[PDB]
Write a protein that binds this DNA or RNA. Structure first.
Ligand code: MG
Ligand code: MG
Ligand code: MG
Ligand code: MG
Ligand code: MG
Ligand code: MG
Ligand code: MG
Ligand code: MG
Ligand code: MG
Ligand code: MG
Ligand code: MG
Ligand code: MG
Ligand code: MG
Ligand code: MG
Ligand code: MG
Ligand code: MG
Ligand code: MG
Ligand code: MG
Ligand code: MG
Ligand code: MG
Ligand code: MG
Ligand code: MG
Ligand code: MG
Ligand code: MG
Ligand code: MG
Ligand code: MG
Ligand code: MG
Ligand code: MG
Ligand code: MG
Ligand code: MG
Ligand code: MG
Ligand code: MG
Ligand code: MG
Ligand code: MG
Ligand code: MG
Ligand code: MG
Ligand code: MG
Ligand code: MG
Ligand code: MG
Ligand code: MG
Ligand code: MG
Ligand code: MG
Ligand code: MG
Ligand code: MG
Ligand code: MG
Ligand code: MG
Ligand code: MG
Ligand code: MG
Ligand code: MG
Ligand code: MG
Ligand code: MG
Ligand code: MG
Ligand code: MG
Ligand code: MG
Ligand code: MG
Ligand code: MG
Ligand code: MG
Ligand code: MG
Ligand code: MG
Ligand code: MG
Ligand code: MG
Ligand code: MG
Ligand code: MG
Ligand code: MG
Ligand code: MG
Ligand code: MG
Ligand code: MG
Ligand code: MG
Ligand code: MG
Ligand code: MG
Ligand code: MG
Ligand code: MG
Ligand code: MG
Ligand code: MG
Ligand code: MG
Ligand code: MG
Ligand code: MG
Ligand code: MG
Ligand code: MG
Ligand code: MG
Ligand code: MG
Ligand code: MG
Ligand code: MG
Ligand code: MG
Ligand code: MG
Ligand code: MG
Ligand code: MG
Ligand code: MG
Ligand code: MG
Lengths: 44, 274
RNA sequence: GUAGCGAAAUUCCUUGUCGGGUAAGUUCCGACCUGCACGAAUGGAGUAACGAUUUCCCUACUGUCUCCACCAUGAACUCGGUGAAAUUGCAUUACGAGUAAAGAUGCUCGUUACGCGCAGCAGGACGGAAAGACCCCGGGACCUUUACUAUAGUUUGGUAUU
RNA sequence: CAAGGGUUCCAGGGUCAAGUUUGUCUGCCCUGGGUGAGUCGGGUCCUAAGGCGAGGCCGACAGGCGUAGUCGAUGGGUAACCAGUUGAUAUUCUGGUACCGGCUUGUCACCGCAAGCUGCGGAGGGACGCAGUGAGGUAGCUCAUCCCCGGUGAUGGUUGUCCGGGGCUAAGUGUGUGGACUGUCUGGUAGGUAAAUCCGCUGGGCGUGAAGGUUGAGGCAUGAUGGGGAGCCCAUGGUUGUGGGUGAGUGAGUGAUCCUGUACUGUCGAGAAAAGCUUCGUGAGCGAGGUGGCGGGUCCGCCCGUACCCUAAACCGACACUGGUGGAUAGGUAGAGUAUACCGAGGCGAUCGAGUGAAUCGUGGUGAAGGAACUCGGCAAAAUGCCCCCGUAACUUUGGGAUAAGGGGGACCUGAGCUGUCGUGCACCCGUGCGGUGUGGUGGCGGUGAGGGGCGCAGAGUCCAGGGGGAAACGACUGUUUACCAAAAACACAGGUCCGUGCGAAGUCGUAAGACGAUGUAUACGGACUGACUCCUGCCCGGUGCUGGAA
RNA sequence: GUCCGAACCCACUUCAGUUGAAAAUGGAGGGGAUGAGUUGUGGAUAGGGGUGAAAGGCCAAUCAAACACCGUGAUAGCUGG
C-alpha cells in the first residue's frame, strides 16, 4: 500500500534544511542544541 | 431571457440557463483583463475565514470603470455587451472618443451603439453618469457613490436600481434596492437607469455540480454535527439545535449592525420582514 | 391536534381483527381504528425515475438441499536440504464414585493399565492470546446545562485624551 | 524516462557472512575500471501559487503584516539529426550533414537640433476553456503473380510462383500542393505615468468583387556517387570477425491516439503570468565623427546531470515482501475494443526439490431423479449474457420505464449485382514549362451480398458475455462518509423559507495592523432550518429567545 | 453530474488469509468510469488548533484533543515487589 514516507528532496530541504532552521529563533535554538549534543548532522 | 432545460437527465429536470441574447461578443477585451487566482475563503493567516468557498471555474477579472468622472465630456460609444463571470450583470465595453476603452456595468436597455457620456451637463439617458445634484428627483439610477470621488458602490448587481427621492440641502435622499432610505452628498455620482440582466434571479441551477463549478462548496447543517463542532450538534436521533438558533460560534440571532457607527445618514431601515 | 396518514423505520398488549397470497404465513400486502406513545419546513401526505439500501412474492436456474459420489491440483503424508513460533512451576501427567476454595492427571477408596513412536480429532488441562471492555469501587478525560466560580468577547455610564 | 536510491554498472579474483535450500553463482565480498554536450534536462532567461522582504505600519518583549523588490516550476522561451563504435558511455565520443549566440575579419550598401549603443517604458505579440464531427494527409500495418536473397524438403505430393526472408534512409535546405491569413492611399486626435512616426479611436479617396501578396499539412528535389541491408570466396577459428562479397528499393489495400489544428462547429461554467520577440519613442547615460544592416571567412561557446535500477530483487513498504509508485512507445489473427484467446518485438521458466491415488483444508470440474425441500436470509453457484431483425406492460414528471417482457436469425462452401479506391489507356479544358480539373476505363485490391448448398449433438460452437417479473418502506435523483468490523434510511444536493448585512458591510482569522468576504454591493454576501417535483403547511405569543418601546 | 463497459478511482458480497505474500491484502464477482472525475509536481492551514458533502472522521500504521522534550523520580486511600 501507500506508506507514510514519500521522499522528495526539495520538500525535505525546504522543511528541515539549514536555512529553514536559520529562518526562525526556534530553529536556531534547535541547531544550537544539536551542536551542544554533538550531532554530526545539524539538519537535513 | 431564460432557456428552460428539457428533462433528459436528472439534475437537468427543472434547471434553466440564460439564453445570452444580450451578448454581442463571446470574448473579452485583452487589455482590460487581470488574473484572478482563487482564495478558497482563506485568510492571509491561511485559515478559512469564509466557509463554503472553493474550486469552480477559472475566472479572469474584468477591470470595471466604477469612477467614470475622469472622462467627463468625452463621449463613449457602447462597443460591446459581454459576459462577466465576476458579477451577475453583463458589462458594456465602451470606446471613448479619444482611444481609451473601458468596462462599465451594462444598464438596462443600453445596446451596442448608444453613445454615453459623463459630466454635470450630461443628458439624462441610461448609461450617462452625473452628480446627484444634476439628476432630476425621481430618476432611477444605479452605481451610486457613498462619498464623492470614491467610486460606485450601491446598486450594482443584476436588476439593481436606486431611486432619487429627495434633494433637500447638501444631501440627496435615495432609496436603496433593499428599501432603505439613505442620504448621500449631492456631489456623489450615479449612472442613469437600472442594471440589466434582471431576469437572472429566475435561473434554476438544477444540479449540485452547477453550484460546485460556480465556486460553492457544500454546506453542512449544524444540527447534524457533534456538540464540539456546533452549538446545534449532538443528540440521539434527529433534534433541533436543542436551544435557540445560533451561529457556529454561538452568536444568537439579532441585529448585528453597530449603532455607534457614524452613519447618521439613515432615514428609514430596510424593513425586510415577511 | 386542522388537512392528511395510521398495528406505521412509530402499536406495549400483539402472532390485534378481517381479507389476499401458501397445503400450512409471528414475516408480507390491503384495510379497520382501540394513535401505550402520527401529524404538517426537527415538514404532512403523495410521487415517475433512480438504489451493491431494507422487506415479501412469482418464474428461470441450479450440489443450497434430499445425499452426497468421483476427478485434478496447493498444502497435509514420505525422503534429502534449511529451519521458526506462541507457551513453559514441575513431571514416569489414566478412569469411576467421592472429597476439597463447593467442577481433581497430582487427595481418598476402588478399577484399569507392557516400553517407545507415527498419522489424525478436538472432550479436558476452568487450553493460549489480551493486569475483562460487562458490573461495582477509586482516579481521569471529554461533552452538557437555568451547578459553582471565573473569564475573552459584547454592552452601560464616569473620567483622561478634550 | 521521472521521482527516489547511490556505484548496485563493467572486468577479474572469492565462497566466512547474506541469498528462506545448494551454489563453482549473485543486485554479496575484495581489487581495478567505467558516466565526455554550444543544441538533450536544469542554471546562466521568465514568471504562477507561495515564500522572504530595504524602508514602513502594527504589536509590553518575543514577534505579525506588507511596499519597492527578490526568489520560487509542476508552466512560457531557447540552436541537431542520421549512422557507427566499447566489457562497461553516447541527440555527449567518431563519420557525414546542420543550426544558434559571440569575437574578429575581407567586402557592399546606408545614416550622421540632428549616427548608433545601452537603459527606461508604451503598444502589438506571447495568451491559453470544454465538447464534437468531418476533410486532406502521413506513420504504422496487410497482401502481392512485381523486385532481390535463398530452398526443392528424413514420410504420400511439391519447378510454378510452391515455400521462407528482405523490399530502408534523418535533421537541415529548396519548391509552394491542399489548407489558412490578408483590401489600398492619405488626414485628424480630450487616451496609452515622459514621449511616440507605434497602438487605440475617428474622417475621407480609390477599390476587384478577388487578385495579388504572405504563409506552409503532406508530396517532390536535395541532404545521399554517402549510410544501412542476405548468402558466397585460397584461407581466418573452429559457440566469435575481418578484405572482398550488398542484391533489391515497387505497386495496391487498409489506416491512426500523429499533422494541417490554437483549424471548423457547438457551447456556458466564460477558461495563468512574465519574459524572450516586433515596433514606437526617450523620464538615463555612453559615444565619437563613428556606426548599424547583407551574402563570405576565422576562432570562442560556461556550470550541474549523464553509469545503473526504475508498472521493481536496486524506489516507499523492517525482507531479494502475491502491496503501492507518475510519464512515454506499444505490432499480428479473431474481436467493437488498450476486454479476452493465441502469437510478434523482446523477455522469461519465478530464488528448495523429489515422490506419493490417505484423511482433512483450500482451488477448480462434473453429476441421475427432484428443484430452495437448504438457510436467519437463494449466502454461494447455476441460469442469462453478443450482434442484426421483430416486438414490448402498469405508471409517467412525456424525458422515461426499456436491453421491459417475449420471439426469429447468425458460423462454413458457393455465389448473381451492388459498391470504395487505384490503374495502362479513349477522347477532352490546358493558363501547358501545373505538383491539374471534369466524363472515362479490359483489371487489381477491399467492403457487402439476394439465391443455392454441406456437415455435426451443438454454427454469438472456444475465451468473453444482463436472469427476468410483481409489490411495500426509506431517500427524489448523480454523488459523500466512520483509512483498519457500519456505504446506509446517515451527509450533501438542486429547490424553499426565516434572520442578519447600506459597505472600513455583516460574518470570520488576528492582541493589533491587516486580511478573507470581494477587486463582490441587497437579483449580493453570511448564518439557521427544510430538502427534486405535486397538493398543502392548520390553532396557540402564555414560557424562553429575538425585535421594538419607555409611564 | 446520460447508458454499457476496460485502463483508472473505489470497496458491496463471499471465500481464503488470520504466528498472513500483506500491521487491512488476495481470488471471484461488485460501484463510478466527461465528471461534485481522477491523478503528478510544488505550495497553504498546526494541537483546545487545523480540516471535515459531518463518521468525533482525518492531521505520518492506536486522535473525545497529535508527537517530542522539559516541570518529572507528577500523583495513585490502589496492585505488585
Ligand atoms: Mg454559505
Ligand atoms: Mg464570483
Ligand atoms: Mg452525527
Ligand atoms: Mg456547546
Ligand atoms: Mg428521537
Ligand atoms: Mg410488535
Ligand atoms: Mg399482524
Ligand atoms: Mg390473515
Ligand atoms: Mg406549523
Ligand atoms: Mg416527529
Ligand atoms: Mg416543525
Ligand atoms: Mg415511493
Ligand atoms: Mg524435511
Ligand atoms: Mg464436596
Ligand atoms: Mg472424578
Ligand atoms: Mg502423590
Ligand atoms: Mg499423537
Ligand atoms: Mg486442529
Ligand atoms: Mg484462558
Ligand atoms: Mg483487571
Ligand atoms: Mg470529573
Ligand atoms: Mg462607552
Ligand atoms: Mg546518478
Ligand atoms: Mg565495487
Ligand atoms: Mg554494495
Ligand atoms: Mg554486476
Ligand atoms: Mg563477478
Ligand atoms: Mg546458503
Ligand atoms: Mg562467483
Ligand atoms: Mg509573487
Ligand atoms: Mg525592517
Ligand atoms: Mg528563478
Ligand atoms: Mg519544467
Ligand atoms: Mg548501457
Ligand atoms: Mg547517437
Ligand atoms: Mg559530434
Ligand atoms: Mg508589453
Ligand atoms: Mg499588450
Ligand atoms: Mg487572455
Ligand atoms: Mg483520415
Ligand atoms: Mg511481406
Ligand atoms: Mg519424399
Ligand atoms: Mg503623457
Ligand atoms: Mg499622442
Ligand atoms: Mg543510460
Ligand atoms: Mg516487489
Ligand atoms: Mg520493468
Ligand atoms: Mg525495500
Ligand atoms: Mg495510481
Ligand atoms: Mg492487440
Ligand atoms: Mg490482455
Ligand atoms: Mg523475441
Ligand atoms: Mg526483464
Ligand atoms: Mg517458489
Ligand atoms: Mg524453481
Ligand atoms: Mg526469495
Ligand atoms: Mg460426462
Ligand atoms: Mg443434479
Ligand atoms: Mg438432469
Ligand atoms: Mg422447474
Ligand atoms: Mg424453507
Ligand atoms: Mg418458499
Ligand atoms: Mg428447515
Ligand atoms: Mg449471489
Ligand atoms: Mg454464476
Ligand atoms: Mg431483452
Ligand atoms: Mg444467406
Ligand atoms: Mg444459436
Ligand atoms: Mg412494515
Ligand atoms: Mg404507505
Ligand atoms: Mg440516495
Ligand atoms: Mg449512488
Ligand atoms: Mg470501515
Ligand atoms: Mg464496508
Ligand atoms: Mg440551496
Ligand atoms: Mg466587522
Ligand atoms: Mg479584501
Ligand atoms: Mg430559524
Ligand atoms: Mg432533514
Ligand atoms: Mg423528509
Ligand atoms: Mg455517467
Ligand atoms: Mg450508472
Ligand atoms: Mg472512501
Ligand atoms: Mg509545506
Ligand atoms: Mg455519535
Ligand atoms: Mg493515523
Ligand atoms: Mg484520547
Ligand atoms: Mg486536556
Ligand atoms: Mg513539581
Amino acid at each position: 500500500m501507500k506508506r507514510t514516507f514519500q521522499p522528495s528532496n526539495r520538500r525535505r530541504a525546504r522543511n528541515h534544511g539549514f536555512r529553514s532552521r536559520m529562518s526562525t529563533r526556534a530553529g536556531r535554538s534547535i541547531l544550537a542544541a544539536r551542536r551542544r549534543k554533538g550531532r554530526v548532522n545539524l539538519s537535513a | 431571457g431564460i432557456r428552460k432545460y428539457k428533462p433528459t437527465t436528472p439534475g437537468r429536470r427543472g434547471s434553466s440557463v440564460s439564453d445570452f441574447v444580450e451578448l454581442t461578443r463571446s470574448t473579452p477585451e485583452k487589455s482590460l483583463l487581470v488574473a484572478k487566482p482563487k482564495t478558497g475563503g482563506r485568510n492571509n493567516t491561511g485559515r478559512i475565514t469564509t466557509r463554503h468557498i472553493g474550486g469552480g471555474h477559472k475566472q479572469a477579472y474584468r477591470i470595471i470603470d466604477f469612477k467614470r468622472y475622469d472622462k467627463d465630456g468625452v463621449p463613449a460609444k457602447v462597443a460591446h455587451i459581454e459576459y462577466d463571470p465576476n458579477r451577475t450583470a453583463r458589462i458594456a465595453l465602451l470606446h471613448y472618443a479619444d482611444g481609451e476603452k473601458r468596462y462599465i456595468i451594462a444598464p438596462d436597455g443600453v445596446g451596442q451603439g448608444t453613445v454615453v457620456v459623463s459630466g454635470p451637463e450630461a443628458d439624462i439617458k441610461p448609461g450617462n453618469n452625473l452628480p446627484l445634484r444634476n439628476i432630476p428627483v425621481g430618476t432611477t439610477v444605479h452605481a451610486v457613490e457613498l462619498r464623492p470621488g470614491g467610486g460606485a458602490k450601491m446598486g450594482r448587481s443584476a436588476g439593481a436600481s436606486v431611486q432619487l427621492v429627495a434633494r433637500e440641502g447638501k444631501y440627496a435622499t435615495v432609496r436603496l434596492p433593499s428599501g432603505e432610505m439613505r442620504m448621500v452628498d449631492i456631489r456623489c455620482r450615479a449612472t442613469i437607469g437600472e442594471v440589466g440582466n434582471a431576469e437572472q434571479i429566475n435561473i434554476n441551477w438544477g444540479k449540485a455540480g452547477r453550484n460546485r463549478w460556480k465556486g460553492i462548496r457544500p454546506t453542512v447543517r449544524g444540527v447534524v454535527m457533534n456538540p464540539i463542532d456546533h452549538p446545534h450538534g449532538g443528540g440521539e436521533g434527529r433534534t433541533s439545535g436543542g436551544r435557540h438558533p445560533v451561529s457556529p460560534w454561538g452568536k444568537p440571532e439579532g441585529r448585528t449592525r453597530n449603532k455607534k457607527k457614524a452613519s447618521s445618514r439613515l432615514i428609514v431601515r430596510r424593513r425586510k420582514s415577511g
